[PDB]
Design a protein around this nucleic acid. Structure first.
Lengths: 120, 96, 95, 87, 83, 95, 94, 55, 87
DNA sequence: AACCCTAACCCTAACCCTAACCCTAACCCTAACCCTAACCCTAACCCTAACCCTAACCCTAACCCTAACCCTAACCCTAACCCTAACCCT
DNA sequence: GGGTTAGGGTTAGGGTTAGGGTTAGGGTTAGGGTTAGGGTTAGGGTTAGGGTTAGGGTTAGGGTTAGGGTTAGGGTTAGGGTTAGGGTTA
């Protein structure tokens, strides 16, 4: 009952492996018995997170006229979104850098009044 | 003489728009080697390990300096004080 | 030759699906590889404790769905839950 | 004639003008005087802690080479999941 | 579910002796609102965590064990109640 | 006539040398019930659960007030400001 | 009714050994019970990860001895290590 | 307000443009002179976010 | 290269056949459990606040060798004069 | 928002097992619910005493000036220390 | 991952003086506290009745496992699409 090549596995555009997670969770000393629908859910969540991160980093990469995803682009993209920063608040990306932001209250003279006189 | 106040912001923007290393490699390697020798002798180091150590130290120093500046600028002072670092470390829970 | 497990083909396929004419760099691949393995031990690690707290030992689809609302924030948690439900529905509809 | 080990001037490896541009990345405009010593002491304490953790890890693995993976694992155990190097 | 008269459950003289336990001598005016808002946000987070936990266990009674587990997951290992 | 400056320290010592509850129970229970009703209706509460919640809230409030006082006393000010709480929350990483 | 596991007899024996004519209170027993179970999942939890990081799966005496220096500070870690070594020596002797 | 708005452009002379910039900035002064059109003042640099080339 | 024994005597050597032999001269008969450990620590300060004086003395005369003529002036400041080996 | 001349790293095919994803039957083991009865969450109220609310009198406390002087702000001749290939091993 | 021999050019380290930034002194005029008084509103007993909490046979729909086939998946390999610097133009 071979019939023809029944293409599946990576169905519905789910490019994440739906099986290596189950293999890594069984030997990972997590639980005694692992279900079948859990790896699918985990792979879907991981693929959605990766796709969101990539689509949020590519838009920031295209702003600097760069079609490459450098670590600086990922650092600027993660530290921009609210949910992405709340999820990755303790993660420090190597070769990333601080977000370009200055600070107010830096000049102490502000008004710059005439302490002298008009007539010398 | 012109009033300063613009070269500092220019240097800040130039160093923020670049991702280059500021601390050297050989002095940091010698320092971590001397520190490791205090616990156990006959120890070596790699390149990626000391690179990750330098990156973590740079991130920690940047965060500490940012916290110190944010604590000092809220007290009507543009400069920071040596006690502000200890204050930030006590608030964050690094030394108790 | 004991090769090491790495997520490269799937990451490149996802990037090409969400952004054409794009790709990954050198250190970006290792960053994404370390990011995947970090959340892999965080979501799956909480499911084991959640199953042990109820005197159980079966981690099914609900154990992973409920762990999304704990790790993920608000809007991302609902989106991931909807994606997982659609995926499990497409899986149960046809094998 | 042919020996010599290590000294201690490496502790003063942090200068004064080089640390000025280092703090400028975060947003610091003006520093002080005792910062060059306080920051050095804090860095020394933190590095001693991280080096002790890496030494304990490499002693568990019965190895004498501090690799990047052990440093990353020690940083993650302390509370700093560093990315880039390792896996 | 009561009217919006429970959110203002923190008074002003009662919170004076509460801050005196830590070492506060004088407070202010907007503290009665800022502390209330911070407490409301933190309680919303803890209640959401406990609701997610009791939904994982398919229960409708927020027990002390679930609250202790949620506090430990957030980063506050509370002792005394539970186990 | 006693000059001000001694009754405050006396009350501080009296409240620190005692381990009695300061916040009520029924208002806190009604508050947490109203909060739980915003997510899902038909919910109940126990006694040990609300007791642990009150204890955790009291500990968090004590810590926040202590941090605010320690931040305010270092700026040559014996009193605290409403911005000091937000400053402490931003430093601790709560926002 | 299914009894619940609690550390009470051993705690009382230890307290009587280190301090005569003493005892535990009501909430103190639950506090100590919650404290024991907290460190029980912290020391044993790190040994599994330490064994998995080296492609192993055997948690022996060295896996617990090395985990002492990671969780415990300085003097307490050395004291606990010495106590564990003397205990394993008395166990292997007879 | 006019002097504070003019000091930002490195010009210590109050011009009608600075007056228009300072009047159309304060909330208390905008509700009073809302129907006042200052001559030779222009408008405010406000561009919609939809007009900008986003994603 | 260099020898791996760069410990430079981590305050050791003076153990059971030395501490007991030194205590037997005074009048100590038995030794309890601890006794030691701190015995090698109380002698560390005796060389920390004495040899530093000799080093500081030799630094004043632009020298580099602590002779026997400088070790007697350092002990005289504390109040323990020695006759014979000094001169 | 020169974008270009420089220009190697991101770049589409392709490709050979290939090692994990799927199939296919057996089981087998993992949730309600209906009797039930027990004790804990909640519902009206009385008192009365510490606890709490509201003016007057005033003694320290924070802030805005005034002059004042010492530390951190900005080149300049260097010339020592930090890189940049290229193999070579143990 | 260390260790070698050129080198050389960007980076690090010696004066310097002048301009605005903490620090020091005097009321100051607005800003919290308290003790005398009273009118509570939360701290304790008595119930008792319903609204939940808490154990137990029994499935059948939820799972778990030994076997193939095999679609999908993992190290190399070009030549081309914008990416870094250098003079121009702006």
């Amino acid at each position: 009952a071979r019939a023809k090549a029944k293409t599946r596995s990576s169905r519905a555009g789910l490019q994440f492996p739906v099986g290596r997670v189950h293999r890594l969770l069984r030997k990972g000393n997590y639980s005694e018995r692992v279900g079948a629908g859990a790896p699918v859910y985990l792979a879907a969540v991981l693929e959605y997170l990766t796709a969101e991160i990539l689509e949020l980093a590519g838009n920031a990469a295209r702003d600097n006229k760069k079609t490459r995803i450098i670590p600086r682009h990922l650092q600027l993209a993660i530290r921009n979104d609210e949910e992405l920063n709340k999820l990755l608040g303790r993660v420090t990306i190597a070769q990333g850098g601080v977000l370009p932001n200055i600070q107010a209250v830096l000049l102490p003279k502000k008004t710059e009044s005439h302490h002298k006189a008009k007539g010398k | 003489r012109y009033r300063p106040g613009t070269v500092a912001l220019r240097e800040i923007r130039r160093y923020q728009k670049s991702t280059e290393l500021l601390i050297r490699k050989l002095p940091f390697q010698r320092l971590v080697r001397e520190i490791a020798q205090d616990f156990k002798t006959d120890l070596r180091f790699q390149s990626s390990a000391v690179m990750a150590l330098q990156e973590a130290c740079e991130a920690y120093l940047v965060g500490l300096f940012e916290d110190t500046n944010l604590c000092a600028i809220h007290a009507k002072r543009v400069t920071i004080m040596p006690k502000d670092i200890q204050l930030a470390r006590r608030i964050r829970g690094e030394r108790a | 030759r004991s090769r090491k497990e790495s997520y490269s083909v799937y990451v490149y396929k996802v990037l090409k699906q969400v952004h054409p004419d794009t790709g990954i760099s050198s250190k970006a691949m290792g960053i994404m590889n370390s990011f995947v393995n970090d959340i892999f031990e965080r979501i799956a690690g909480e499911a084991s404790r959640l199953a042990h707290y109820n005197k159980r030992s079966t981690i099914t689809s609900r154990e992973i769905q409920t762990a999304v609302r704990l790790l993920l924030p608000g809007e991302l948690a609902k989106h991931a839950v909807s994606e997982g439900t659609k995926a499990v529905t497409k899986y149960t509809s046809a094998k | 004639k042919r020996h010599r080990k290590v000294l201690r001037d490496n502790i003063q490896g942090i200068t004064k003008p080089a640390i000025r541009r280092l703090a400028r990345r975060g947003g610091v405009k003006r520093i002080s005087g005792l910062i060059y010593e306080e920051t050095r002491g804090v860095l020394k304490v933190f590095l001693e802690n991280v080096i002790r953790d890496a030494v304990t890890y490499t002693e568990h693995a019965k190895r004498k080479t501090v690799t990047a993976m052990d440093v990353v694992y020690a940083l993650k155990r302390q509370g700093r999941t560093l990315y880039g190097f390792g896996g």
